[PDB]
Design a protein around this ligand. Structure first.
Ligand code: CLA
Ligand code: CLA
Ligand code: CLA
Ligand code: CLA
Ligand code: CLA
Ligand code: CLA
Ligand code: CLA
Ligand code: CLA
Ligand SMILES: CCCCCCCCCCCCCCCC(=O)OC[C@H](COP(=O)(O)OC[C@@H](O)CO)OC(=O)CCCCCCCCCCCCCCC
Ligand SMILES: CC1=C(C/C=C(\C)CCC[C@H](C)CCC[C@H](C)CCCC(C)C)C(=O)c2ccccc2C1=O
Ligand code: SF4
Ligand code: SF4
Ligand code: SF4
Lengths: 73, 61, 83, 154, 119, 80, 38, 741
């Protein structure tokens, strides 16, 4: 019960790290502050400024769905 | 305003928003962004030296 | 590209007769290399569903005959490279 | 139910099981074998291992559980390595912070983190020992924190 | 294909029979005097323009955009001028008054057919 | 079409035009900078939107922004 | 002269130091094995 | 012509440039303004063809780095001979090999891990060897520990000669490019000097060491009455009793009376039923055949004396009409670029390593190798995986040659770029073959899966159902049964017992059994044809589309490790020639995962196991392949679930480290996925949101903490996918068969 319930709280806090991340950095981050202009599920910003794979607010969904299935796992 | 002055920025989209930096160039030739400022740390493009206007340009003492 | 498709049959005598008269006894063919095949096709030719995987002188002298026959007709087309 | 561990029966069954099960490997070698001597020292490392758990709380499994309430009857379980550990990583955190606020003002700060100034590094490595009342005296000075650093839009 | 899609016909001239590389792939013969080249899409053609221009002098070159109704267009060069070189004939379109910092929030563009930068 | 908009950080250092492999961007003489240049994007119907411009745009934050708009034949960049 | 400057880099110091703390734990777990108290 | 032109005192040997990390690249000596300088410090650390375009300075760097590699290999082999000397039970193993399990590494006694010391007999415990070194040493004739200490000492001595060698060839005597592009001499000395004198001198070792010693051990003499290998050469009278052909000397050699050497050298094949390995008479005769045949093979390259070929006049004469120009250009391709040579040599090296794997299960060449099955297993398995990865390096370095060192001027209408003129017709028919083989290699498993699940087992592809007996493999396998009398005329037994006669039982353990291939083995071969064609699809797509695709018509301008082009063209993520190598590593893990899962389960059902009296047979799984390989529930149940029982129940026992390398290697596997699925546009401002928490406390790192780059952030996902996924099968295999074999 101890070690698992800590694992569950790990799942809740990771999954809210992701969701609260790309829900509060949904609008603009210091990588790209243009994010509010592109809508929700825009793909990327290209390789520019280091590379921008999955910057959108849709990524927080896209990754915390893995953490959802894991945590409910 | 002057060259070499340590300047904090007030434009929220710069990488160096609320970080002080040294003024390299001040141009008096009607440029909308005349003040070329470089920094200690570096943004994602590998480029510290950018430029700014006068409203986004706060010196210190 | 196939500029000279002149003859094919010259390979056949070019491959049967170079393997018929050499017997080289203690192998599958106690006779020559091609006599052990042409003798071993007329037993099977008149609509015989036999010839299993243990049929040595037919199946082995299929591949060991055609792998030299193919090569010698291909080299027969190389026999129209000097033209 | 948390029984005291020295009198839990299934705990002593784990004692018999690991001593005897480890002794099943001891039934291969002669009396002067170095392997056999290693299993002598290993049986020592099982009886000492189980007698030195005399004040834990092995429950119904015979496995020594812990307590994290700070009951002061179980402070040697958790809270004493808690204070010890927070001292060690308050050391490490204070050394890292003091070294970075050294090399933030050098000639080439980018070079200073590749190639550590082992002079000034092993200065701070040792000098961060009294970090509770050095962070408490820098925190009253208005120097531990910062203000008006970088942020995104809003 | 040529029945329904735009074939881009890069035309150019040279001085010597050199060897360039196609955007299709593999080397090409490079007729010395004057030669055309029908291509598929524009990035192939201007990638060939960078393929030639970063090597050596290949100028007086431009693709005629063959569109399947029949007529041509003039890409690249447009104005006998190289595009990063400044000619005082190109009229600017595609600018706004300031940076991103004065773009409106998309909750002001919401339920309207505008863009988040139009001001 | 991918709407390419070129803001007023554009100090006219022409890495955009030299970086774009499509000649959608040119340089326009604009007396607002030190170099007197500011890029323009007239032929955004040919614009792929590969954002190779925004890689080589050495402004503070991205004078030239490439908004991913419609997808025509040329803007999808398909060969056939 | 510059050899110590190589011995002051990030991975070399990290191995001469994590080798040392790893030696603290391994030598401190032969001498005091099975330390669940304190 | 041929001469040796070597610069002396080239580079000073100071420690000064060690204090400048990233001295080597002018694009990288700027100093780290970001942490991506750190990782690019290592990925550019061996871009020798990207430091400077000067091929001389590059070629000095690589040719000196080779001696660093051989220095690590001699440190490694000296490690194996010393761990055989000091730590191993090899002298005890040499008494009875079928009883004592081989072990070298004796785990230090700290908390718990002394339980990893497996009581493997020999009066001494320790973790069990599966690398099979002892079987290499009994074949070598190493009798007591002194030759292992001495050969480890010579291993360190050769390691010192390689360190001093590479130091000597970068700094104070380093050759010109005219030395390096002397390729007729390089082949002329590797075909003859390396391989030729290697196999000839090794035939000398086997005849004058291994044949008398492994005749005395074949008689069963303990390693005390065996004399030194040494003591067989001082007098022939200790060998004339063992082989009377040594009494005649070399006189029947020089008189060409080579009938007299039938005692020393023969052509038997098969397996010695006492030792379970090859006859070392056959193996020494074999290395004489490589000796004369390679030493003849060396002398086909004209160097100084106008006798031999050049590569140029060979390649130019193959000017065939369907290629037009012929091979005009490849000698300038393969003597100017190193990545091209690395593509060829890695392809042939890896495929040689797979050939090594097959020829070690089915013709076990070392004595008592097929009697301890883990060494029989993993020496198959390991030479598969380096047998795999080195192919993908081909697909890497044939791509890099197409990106970096390709030149259309020298390479105009030849055999090379005429492929690239129809690379759509290459990749399109690889595409068709991949889908055809995928349907007809895996749809048969979904088919038999459903038909066994729908109850209609008559409609499967079993033995009893619709049979798919592999006709050609059974037929040519029957030709190999009929080898030693018919066509291999002077043979006695077959080429292997994976083909022909009755099995070989050595100490109630089955050395090699005639493998039957029926209607399940068929479908696994079409798996292997399939997953070989997919990696050939990705690694020919990565070379033909390496430079100018019709999607992106400038990849030569972008580079090799570029991530992408952008969201344009609807998105062009993962499009570079590097990215196809990134995918070829996953499909490498697939293709070899099912090569070894085909191995380690057909050869636990159809070869391995024990025998009892009256010649009775008992496999490890007990014939449970052909009724169970045809589905996937039979595959996953009967192999990946049932064979886990000796890995998963391994706690408390000596196999338990594998039970730790089973779980944790799952971990790393799944830990790969975080790098594969996400991207750095998330992690960069997650990290920067943590950089807020450091800027608040003035713990701002001076080297600015970026996320990983895209090609790094996926490369690390491959490199954990393979370490995790490979180490799962590693601990599963060795934890399986040690608990039986
Ligand atoms: C200079 C040392 C130093 C200090 C004082 C801190 C302090 C902090 N970090 Mg941390 N961090 C460091 C180095 C450091 N970090 C390094 C090197 C990394 C990269 C691995 C990280 C990665 C990191 C993450 C990802 C996160 C933090 C967070 C935090 C905060 C919460 C405490 C915590 O869980 O730590 C976290 C500790 C670790 C992740 C591992 C320990 C880091 C190293 C190994 C120990 C320090 C040794 C250092 C190398 C010594 C250098 C100086 C010496 C050579 C002279 C705290 C302010 C968290 C935060 O924002 O909370 C508010 C958070 O999410 N840190
Ligand atoms: C760098 C870490 C480190 C540290 C701090 C120590 C510290 C110590 N070692 Mg030690 N040791 C180390 C690494 C280290 N060792 C390594 C890597 C080896 C393997 C070669 C050894 C092998 C070793 C032996 C063989 C012995 C020590 C002993 C000792 C103790 C002598 C007083 C002291 C606590 C001695 C001791 O007190 O043990 C009884 C002793 O006999 N050590
Ligand atoms: C991060 C979680 C975590 C925590 C809290 C612990 C905690 C513990 N582990 Mg441990 N362990 C972990 C993860 C963790 N482990 C993992 C991931 C592994 C797998 C690699 C192990 C493998 C492992 C082994 C193999 C052993 C432990 C042991 C122990 C116990 C004593 C540690 C020790 O050596 O003391 C001795 C160390 C010291 C006294 C050093 C402190 C002295 C300081 C530094 C000096 C300065 C003071 C100022 C302790 C309860 C040991 C034990 O007996 O279990 C109960 C033991 O034998 N662990
Ligand atoms: C017949 C002579 C001979 C022999 C035996 C070798 C052997 C070797 N060469 Mg080599 N080479 C030769 C002639 C020879 N070469 C000539 C004439 C040229 C010029 C055209 C080259 C050019 C060349 C290059 C460019 C490279 C090699 C490499 C290698 C190594 C391949 C790795 C290997 O198989 O590991 C097996 C290892 C061994 C069998 C160990 C053998 C070492 C012993 C001491 C024999 C070495 C003899 C040595 C040449 C004597 C130096 C003479 C000097 C004192 C005057 C191998 C050691 C590659 C390598 O790894 O670099 C080292 C490599 O990149 N060679
Ligand atoms: C490089 C390999 C090598 C070397 C150094 C030697 C060296 C030697 N051999 Mg030899 N030998 C070799 C390969 C080699 N052999 C091979 C491959 C064969 C098989 C054809 C033989 C067959 C052979 C015979 C039959 C005899 C020798 C003998 C000898 C010794 C005297 C000549 C001498 C030590 C003679 C001997 O034992 O000493 C007089 C002898 O009678 N050898
Ligand atoms: C289990 C997961 C899985 C599966 C099934 C596949 C399947 C495939 N991959 Mg693949 N791939 C995977 C994971 C997978 N991949 C992963 C994880 C990676 C990461 C590296 C890749 C990377 C990769 C690359 C890089 C490439 C492929 C390609 C292919 C195709 C090879 C051709 C073939 O086998 O056709 C046969 C199809 C099958 C065996 C799938 C099962 C179909 C059954 C047999 C029949 C149809 C079922 C049913 C009748 C459907 C109708 C009913 C329904 C409508 C209701 C094939 C579709 C290649 C490709 O795209 O072109 C060849 C290619 O180039 N894959
Ligand atoms: C791709 C692999 C594969 C293959 C070979 C088969 C084959 C078969 N399945 Mg099947 N099956 C598969 C995958 C496959 N399945 C999968 C993946 C599923 C689950 C999604 C199923 C589910 C399934 C069910 C549920 C059933 C079958 C059944 C059958 C059998 C009869 C089906 C039939 O009428 O064929 C249809 C064949 C054709 C329409 C002909 C097309 C193919 C021709 C031969 C191609 C020829 C091209 C030619 C060579 C071109 C060159 C010539 C040209 C140049 C002139 C047959 C043995 C049935 C059965 O009872 O089994 C006995 C049945 O009930 N299957
Ligand atoms: C007569 C000398 C001789 C002898 C005694 C051996 C003996 C052996 N070889 Mg062999 N081998 C030889 C010559 C010889 N080889 C030659 C000349 C080659 C190169 C073509 C090879 C290539 C070779 C490979 C690749 C492998 C062996 C292996 C083996 C071992 C397996 C046991 C067996 O049944 O093999 C019997 C050996 C054979 C049937 C090989 C016959 C090769 C003939 C002589 C080639 C003649 C070439 C000639 C130019 C004519 C070409 C045309 C021809 C194909 C019709 C055995 C020790 C295997 C091994 O490593 O064991 C684990 C293995 O994988 N050999
Ligand atoms: C291998 C047999 C391939 C027949 C190629 C015939 C062949 O080699 O002809 C040789 C021909 C080259 O003709 P040239 O006279 O130009 O050849 C001389 C020059 O190539 C050398 O200078 O090669 C091609 O045209 C390749 C055509 C691809 C043919 C597509 C099939 C190849 C892929 C199929 C693999 C099948 C394996 C089947 C196993 C049963
Ligand atoms: C997690 C993750 C990161 C973050 C990884 C971080 C940046 C690296 C963490 C490991 C480094 C090495 C930790 C740094 C620690 C230093 C070595 C110092 C610590 C002290 C000792 C260990 C020496 C990415 O950058 C990334 C990029 C692209 C796709 C996916 C991902 C991704 O999944
Ligand atoms: S890969 Fe991810 S980041 Fe690089 S371009 Fe394609 S999408 Fe943008
Ligand atoms: S915007 Fe950036 S790129 Fe475009 S011109 Fe001005 S500087 Fe050169
Ligand atoms: S959008 Fe893509 S194509 Fe149009 S300019 Fe910017 S980068 Fe070049």
């Amino acid at each position: 019960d101890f070690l698992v319930h800590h694992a569950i709280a790990l799942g809740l806090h990771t999954t809210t790290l992701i969701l609260v991340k790309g829900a509060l950095d949904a609008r603009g981050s210091k990588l790209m502050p243009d994010k509010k202009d592109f809508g929700y599920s825009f793909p990327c910003d290209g390789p520019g400024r280091g590379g921008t794979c999955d910057i959108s607010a849709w990524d927080a969904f896209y990754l915390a769905m893995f953490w959802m299935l894991n945590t409910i796992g | 305003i002057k060259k070499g002055s340590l300047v904090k920025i007030l434009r929220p989209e710069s990488f160096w928003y609320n970080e002080v930096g040294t003024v390299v160039n001040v141009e008096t030739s009607k440029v909308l962004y005349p003040v070329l400022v470089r920094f200690d740390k570096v943004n994602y493009s590998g480029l510290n030296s950018t430029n700014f206007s006068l409203d986004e340009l706060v010196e210190i003492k | 590209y196939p500029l000279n498709p002149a003859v094919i049959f010259i390979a056949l005598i070019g491959w049967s007769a170079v393997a018929a008269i050499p017997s080289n006894i203690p192998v599958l063919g106690g006779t020559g290399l091609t006599q052990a095949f042409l003798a071993s096709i007329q037993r099977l030719l008149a609509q015989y569903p036999t010839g299993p995987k243990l049929d040595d002188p037919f199946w082995f002298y299929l591949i060991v005959y055609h792998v030299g026959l193919f090569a010698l007709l291909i080299f027969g087309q190389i026999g129209y490279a000097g033209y | 139910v948390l029984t005291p561990c020295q009198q839990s029966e299934a705990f002593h069954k784990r004692e018999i099981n690991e001593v005897r099960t480890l002794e099943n490997r001891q039934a291969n070698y002669e009396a002067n074998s170095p392997s056999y001597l290693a299993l002598q020292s290993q049986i020592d490392q099982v009886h000492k291992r189980f007698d030195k758990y005399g004040t834990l709380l092995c429950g119904q499994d015979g496995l020594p559980h812990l307590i994290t309430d700070g009951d002061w009857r179980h402070a040697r379980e958790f809270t004493i390595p808690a204070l010890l550990f927070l001292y060690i990583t308050g050391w490490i955190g204070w050394v890292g912070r003091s070294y970075l606020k050294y090399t933030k003002e050098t000639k080439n700060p980018t070079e200073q983190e590749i190639i550590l100034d082992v002079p000034m590094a092993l200065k701070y490595m040792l000098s961060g020992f009294l970090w509770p009342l050095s962070a408490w005296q820098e925190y009253r000075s208005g120097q531990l924190l910062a203000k008006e650093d970088e942020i995104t839009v809003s | 294909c040529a029945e329904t899609e735009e074939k881009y016909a890069m035309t150019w001239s040279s001085d010597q029979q050199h060897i360039f590389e196609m955007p299709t792939g593999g080397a090409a013969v490079m007729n010395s005097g004057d030669n055309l080249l029908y291509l598929a899409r524009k990035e192939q053609a201007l990638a060939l323009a960078t393929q030639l221009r970063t090597q050596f002098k290949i100028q007086d070159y431009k693709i005629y955009r063959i569109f399947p109704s029949g007529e041509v267009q003039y890409l690249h060069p447009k104005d006998g001028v190289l595009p990063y070189q400044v000619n005082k004939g190109r009229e600017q379109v595609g600018r706004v008054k300031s940076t991103i910092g004065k773009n409106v929030n998309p909750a002001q563009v919401k339920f309207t057919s505008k863009a988040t930068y139009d001001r | 079409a991918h709407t390419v908009k070129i803001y007023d950080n554009c100090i006219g250092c022409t890495q955009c035009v030299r970086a774009c492999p499509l000649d959608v961007l040119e340089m326009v003489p604009w007396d607002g900078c030190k170099a007197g240049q500011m890029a323009s994007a007239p032929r955004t119907e040919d614009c792929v939107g590969c954002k190779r411009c925004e890689t080589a745009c050495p402004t503070d934050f991205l004078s030239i922004r490439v908004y991913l708009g419609g997808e025509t034949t040329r803007s999808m960049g398909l060969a056939y | 002269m510059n050899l110590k400057k190589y011995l002051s880099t990030a991975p070399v110091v990290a191995t001469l130091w994590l080798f040392l703390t790893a030696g603290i734990l391994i030598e401190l777990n032969r001498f005091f094995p099975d330390s669940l108290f304190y | 012509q041929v001469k040796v032109v070597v610069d002396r005192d080239v580079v000073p040997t100071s420690f000064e440039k060690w204090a400048k990390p990233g001295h080597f690249s002018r694009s990288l000596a700027k100093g780290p303004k970001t942490t991506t300088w750190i990782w690019n410090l290592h990925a550019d650390a061996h871009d020798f063809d990207s430091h400077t375009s000067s091929l001389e300075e590059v070629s000095r760097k690589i040719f000196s780095a080779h001696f660093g590699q051989l220095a690590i290999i001699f440190i490694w082999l000296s490690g194996m001979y010393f761990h055989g000397a000091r730590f191993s039970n090899y002298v005890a193993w040499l008494s009875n090999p079928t009883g004592i399990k081989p072990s070298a590494q004796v785990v230090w006694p700290i908390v718990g891990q002394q339980i990893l010391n497996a009581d493997v007999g020999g009066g001494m415990q320790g973790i069990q060897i599966t690398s099979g070194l002892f079987q290499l040493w009994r074949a070598s004739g190493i009798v007591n520990e002194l030759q292992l200490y001495v050969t480890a000492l010579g291993g360190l001595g050769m390691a010192g000669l390689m360190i001093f060698a590479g130091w000597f060839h970068y700094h104070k005597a380093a050759p010109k490019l005219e030395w390096f592009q002397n390729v007729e001499s390089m082949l002329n000395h590797h075909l003859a000097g390396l391989l030729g004198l290697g196999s000839l001198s090794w035939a000398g070792h086997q005849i004058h060491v291994s044949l008398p010693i492994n005749k005395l051990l074949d008689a069963g003499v303990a390693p005390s009455s065996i004399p030194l290998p040494h003591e067989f050469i001082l007098n022939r009278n200790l060998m004339a009793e063992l082989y009377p052909s040594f009494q005649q000397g070399l006189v029947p050699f020089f008189t060409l009376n080579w009938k007299q050497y039938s005692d020393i050298l023969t052509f038997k094949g098969g397996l010695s039923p006492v030792t379970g390995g090859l006859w070392l008479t056959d193996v020494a005769h074999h290395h004489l055949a490589i000796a004369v045949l390679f030493l003849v093979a060396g002398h086909m390259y004209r160097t100084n004396w106008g006798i031999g070929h050049s590569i140029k006049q060979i390649l130019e004469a193959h000017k065939g009409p369907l290629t037009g120009e012929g091979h005009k250009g490849l000698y300038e391709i393969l003597t100017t670029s190193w990545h091209a040579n690395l593509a060829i040599n890695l392809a042939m090296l890896g495929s040689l390593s797979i050939i090594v794997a097959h020829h070690m299960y089915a013709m076990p060449p070392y004595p008592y190798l097929a009697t301890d099955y883990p060494t029989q297993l993993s020496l198959f398995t390991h030479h598969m995986w380096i047998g795999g990865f080195c192919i993908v390096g081909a697909g890497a370095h044939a791509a890099i040659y197409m990106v970096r060192d390709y030149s259309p001027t020298v390479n105009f209408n030849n055999v090379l770029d005429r492929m690239i003129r129809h690379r759509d017709a290459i990749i399109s028919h690889l595409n068709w073959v991949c889908i055809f083989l995928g349907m007809h290699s895996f749809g048969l498993y979904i088919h038999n899966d459903t038909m066994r699940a729908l109850g209609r087992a008559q409609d499967m592809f079993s033995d009893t159902a619709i049979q798919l007996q592999p006709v050609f493999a059974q037929w040519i396998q029957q030709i190999h049964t009929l080898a030693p009398g018919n066509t291999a005329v002077n043979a006695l037994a077959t080429a292997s017992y994976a083909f022909g006669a009755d099995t070989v039982t050595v100490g109630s353990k089955i050395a090699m059994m005639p493998i039957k291939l029926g209607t399940a083995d068929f479908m696994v071969h079409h798996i292997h044809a399939f997953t070989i064609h997919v990696t050939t699809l990705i690694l020919l797509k990565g070379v033909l589309y390496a430079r100018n695709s019709r999607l992106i018509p400038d990849k030569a301008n972008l580079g090799f490790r570029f991530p992408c082009d952008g969201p344009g063209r609807g998105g062009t993520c993962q499009v570079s020639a590097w990215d196809h190598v990134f995918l070829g590593l996953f499909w490498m893990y697939n293709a070899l995962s099912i090569v070894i899962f085909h191995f380690s389960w057909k050869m636990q059902s159809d070869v391995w196991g024990t025998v009892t009296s009256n010649g009775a047979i008992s496999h490890i799984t007990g014939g449970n392949f052909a009724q169970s390989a045809i589905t996937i529930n039979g595959w996953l149940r009967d192999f990946l679930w049932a064979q886990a029982s000796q890995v998963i129940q391994s706690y408390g026992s000596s196999l338990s480290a594998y039970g730790l390398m089973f779980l944790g290697a799952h971990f790393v596997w799944a830990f790969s996925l975080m790098f594969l699925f996400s991207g750095r546009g998330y992690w960069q401002e997650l990290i920067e949101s943590i950089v807020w928490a450091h800027n608040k406390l003035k713990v701002a790192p001076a080297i600015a903490p970026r996320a990983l780059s895209i090609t790094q952030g996926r490369a690390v996902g491959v490199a954990h996918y393979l370490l995790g996924g490979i180490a799962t099968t590693w601990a599963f295999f060795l934890a399986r068969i040690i608990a039986v074999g």
